[PDB]
Design an enzyme around this catalytic site. Structure first.
Site, mmCIF file in Angstrom:
data_model
loop_
_atom_site.group_PDB
_atom_site.id
_atom_site.type_symbol
_atom_site.label_atom_id
_atom_site.label_comp_id
_atom_site.label_asym_id
_atom_site.label_seq_id
_atom_site.Cartn_x
_atom_site.Cartn_y
_atom_site.Cartn_z
ATOM 1 N N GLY A 37 51.319 13.601 -19.063
ATOM 2 C CA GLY A 37 50.612 14.907 -19.307
ATOM 3 C C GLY A 37 50.832 15.706 -20.373
ATOM 4 C CG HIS A 81 46.954 6.845 -25.027
ATOM 5 N ND1 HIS A 81 47.833 6.928 -25.952
ATOM 6 C CD2 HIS A 81 46.915 7.570 -23.962
ATOM 7 C CE1 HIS A 81 48.450 8.131 -25.479
ATOM 8 N NE2 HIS A 81 47.906 8.399 -24.333
ATOM 9 C CD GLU A 132 47.929 5.675 -29.449
ATOM 10 O OE1 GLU A 132 47.782 4.342 -29.983
ATOM 11 O OE2 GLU A 132 47.307 6.076 -28.437
#
Ligand SMILES: COC(=O)[C@@]1(c2ccc(C)cc2)CCNC1
Length: 182
Positions: free
Chosen positions: A146, A41, A72
């Site tokens: 984050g 992503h 991923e």
């Protein structure tokens, strides 16, 4: 504080860089030579910023399993003038559960951050942001925006990279030794 943080510290001080794409700042784990990993992503392009230096991407591959299911993990080869310490001997060979894991993050926003996340479950399938995903590890810590790309370690092993959370649990994509053979 202990051997958990001792292991995480050394992986962070030698094997991580700060990667910036158009989708944000990520902790990026360097594995060997000029090869690193980042969550898919992050949407890596032809150019990425590595510790705020403009860097050409020589190759990038979004991994999927043999069922054509998202993992991923993106493997990136960087046009960088320096090799990472080879840490492939710290990667597990098989899918597993773990005790006593640390999630370590280094960004502009979260420098030198180490979180003891405790027990890690081989969760397997997760619908991650709408995307069916396999080989997910799960830990019961309320991780926040984050922390993506953050490294998950136990004493002696580098087991995954943080890819999401639901406010109560965090999720990592497994790293396996077989991803990085050459
Ligand atoms: C990346 O980790 C390392 O290289 C060190 C390590 C290796 C293995 C264990 C169980 C703890 C610490 C050796 C030097 N100080 C950290």
């Amino acid at each position: 504080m202990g051997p958990g943080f001792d292991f995480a510290q050394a992986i962070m001080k030698k094997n991580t860089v700060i990667a910036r794409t158009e989708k944000g700042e990520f902790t990026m784990l360097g594995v060997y030579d000029r090869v690193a990993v980042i969550p898919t992503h992050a949407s890596v392009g032809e150019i990425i910023y590595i510790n705020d230096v403009e860097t050409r991407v020589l190759d990038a591959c979004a991994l999927r399993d043999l069922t054509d299911t998202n993992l991923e993990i993106t493997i990136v080869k960087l046009d960088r003038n320096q090799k990472f310490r080879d840490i492939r001997h710290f990667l597990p060979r098989c899918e597993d559960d773990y005790n006593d894991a640390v999630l370590s993050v280094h960004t502009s926003k979260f420098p030198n951050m180490y979180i003891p996340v405790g027990q890690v479950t081989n969760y397997g399938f997760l619908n991650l942001g709408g995307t069916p995903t396999h080989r997910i590890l799960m830990y019961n810590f309320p991780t926040r925006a984050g922390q993506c790309g953050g490294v998950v370690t136990t004493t002696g092993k580098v087991i995954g990279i943080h890819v999401g959370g639901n406010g109560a649990q965090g999720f990592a994509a497994m790293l396996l030794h077989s991803y990085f053979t050459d």
